[PDB]
């Protein structure tokens, strides 16, 4: 569990993966592909590129569509609990 105070445009990282758009063949997980410099994620350390996301305010992300994961990450107040 990595805690983050979301910033102006977001958590400060990008994602790929999800059912229908398998980042890795046969895998629907959501993976962190980029960490924006100076974003909240970066500054706070705990998360890095390549990490598999598990949950957001324990909405499990194990196997959901890419868009569901996006929304799940947009609709979580300034306070956020990660994986």
């Amino acid at each position: 569990e990595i805690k983050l105070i979301k910033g102006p445009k977001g958590l400060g990282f990008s994602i790929a993966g999800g059912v229908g758009n398998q980042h890795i063949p046969g895998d629907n997980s959501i993976y962190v592909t980029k960490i924006i410099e100076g974003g909240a994620a970066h500054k706070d350390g705990k998360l890095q590129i390549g990490d598999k996301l598990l949950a957001v305010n324990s909405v499990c992300l194990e196997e959901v569509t890419h868009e569901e994961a996006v929304t799940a990450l947009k609709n979580t107040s300034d306070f956020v609990y990660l994986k």
């Binding site: 445009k9 977001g10 990008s14 994602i15 790929a16 924006i36 890419h66």
Partner: peptide
């Protein structure tokens, strides 16, 4: 192919 800024 979808990669998104969050």
């Amino acid at each position: 192919r979808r990669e998104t800024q969050v």
